[PDB]
Design a protein around this ligand. Structure first.
Ligand SMILES: [Cl-]
Ligand SMILES: [Cl-]
Ligand SMILES: [Cl-]
Ligand SMILES: [Cl-]
Lengths: 183, 208, 183, 208
């Protein structure tokens, strides 16, 4: 039965909302169990005075647990053209998983919010995931709302639009179909 | 359709390459050998058309003796996985491979390649730009909706640094020398053999 | 006295207009001679039925002449996430310049229009130019309209906005100051 | 200001690095040697703070004997060119270098680094991700408005493929081995020496 983790970071809630649509799409696939988790905050609690959304219901993930899922869909804001420092720090802590090959051949996909360079954020995440041997799922133009990027769903952070959310649902279903078929 | 539907399916792998001096042709053979290890997989090797003048090619020492047939853009739609091989042009795919992929706009418009499996291998003269040749190709393939297969560190020859050695976590590679005089090494061929098998297992599993 | 080439490709005219602002900014620098040229079209004349802008006054450049300038500012639309095939084909034809080191240490900068991934188009052009040994000029946040990308001016192709054109003028001046100082 | 203004200027180069096992520290020395060949250039080597626990570092065999002083984020504003050195973390800069650059948000907000010269050198265990470590760092530096210096094929050692050899057109590199047991080679040190001289000439010319 396949297990999908929707793992995200969100400061203002935009990526949180997109992750909900990602998960919704993946749950459309029979026999797929979907879990939503957030990576730990890296800023001090009082600075996060920056207007951060402290009311986030998703449980906090640990790097250790990435090995328990068959597919992982990563969501992140952009920071100075790259993935958020929060998501980067989390992935920087997977050296034990790397050395043991624990993530090898698992399915990965990425969604992002525009800080702003959404596309480099996704493709640079792809580069990092390649080092673990993940199979990488772009979305192409399968969602008709693309006529969002072909690399993965995105939003411009002021809530995500219905069109952006439709593309995220498509991505979640697409990734989950592939993961379930590979399992 | 009462007779059009086959009782058995195979996963169809195309190894599509461009090579001027043969280095990628040789890796393409190892890619295919690896894919052939997988039960239920058909493997085909084809090359993209030459774009340079024939006299320039021959005067530059090019290898005109390449037996693989020339591919048509349209037929990529007939395969389940496509492993693309190319020399670099300043960190990008060859003009030859790029020109060929530019002729798949009709396949793009109809979604004909959507959800197929893709993987990339490359050559450079000195190593320069080998990684970006692969990852920039990924970007183009994402617009067709291909699933992208890197190799990670699955081939242990990637940890050997005792000799000049192509191969990256993004895909197999070979180092030809600035003049093309280096031959692909046994370690480079092994990494390419791993890539083909890996890609074919994934493709076969998705087709099963 | 420093020589800047503004070299662009444009199908619908958006990049042509941005190139005019690039050149305008560079001409603000005393002692800088600025030339605007376009790369040759690669499509057949009748297809370019696609609504192309045939009335483009800029002369057509040859790859050979890149060696005659001290700085080159490259403008291109995006194609399927990368530089236009027209600009790529032009750069693919610089192998003789590469082998002789003719472009080594010259100044380069890039502007793009969104097809759509403007940022990968610019940074992938940077990668190609590195192989020739160009010095690469981003624009950062020097133009206050950025608060366009920090990698170079951009437009969304439906004419370029005054804000986009202001950023292009800034880029042209910035690049030309650097080129003149290096000469 | 009647006395604050100096009669003579020097171009100030900072070689800023992170190194766990010393490979990048050794290349940083060659970078600096090269920059020192240029008349009118002051060269300073500094390292970014360690982020890992001291006991983990020492138990992993880390090199605690590094004489270069530890840099502060704020002082990057005092230099004219900065050559950044780092091991890779999965195709990205080290967490240590990244954490340090994250503390330059104040310099970013005031434009303090705008228009300075930047260049990058890197290490990997097997070569994997060496190119992307450099080019992804370029992207971060572009947000500060740095001028970016690749090295192209100016160092002829880049054409030698007879031995395992770091170095790319994006910047110098070294191959440490998966266990860190390889030492930087004379060819790798020469390429780094070229990079430092090249960067310093460019910086000196812009300061003149
Ligand atoms: Cl957010
Ligand atoms: Cl080849
Ligand atoms: Cl245009
Ligand atoms: Cl190191």
């Amino acid at each position: 039965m396949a297990k999908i983790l929707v793992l995200y970071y969100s400061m203002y809630g935009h990526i949180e909302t997109l992750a909900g649509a990602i998960a919704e799409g993946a749950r459309k696939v029979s026999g797929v169990d979907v879990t939503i988790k957030r990576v730990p905050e890296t800023m001090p609690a009082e600075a996060f005075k920056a207007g951060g959304k402290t009311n986030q219901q998703a449980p906090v993930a640990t790097p250790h647990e990435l090995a328990d899922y068959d597919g992982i869909i990563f969501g992140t804001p952009t920071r100075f053209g790259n993935m958020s420092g929060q998501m980067r720090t989390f992935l920087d802590q997977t050296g034990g998983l790397w050395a043991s090959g624990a993530l090898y051949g698992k399915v990965a996909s990425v969604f992002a919010s525009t800080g702003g360079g959404q596309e480099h954020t996704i493709t640079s995440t792809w580069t990092t995931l390649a080092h673990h041997g993940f199979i990488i799922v772009p979305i192409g133009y399968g969602a008709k709302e693309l006529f969002g990027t072909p690399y993965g769903a995105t939003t411009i952070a002021r809530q995500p639009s219905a069109e952006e959310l439709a593309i995220a649902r498509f991505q979640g279903e697409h990734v989950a179909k592939i993961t379930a078929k590979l399992k």
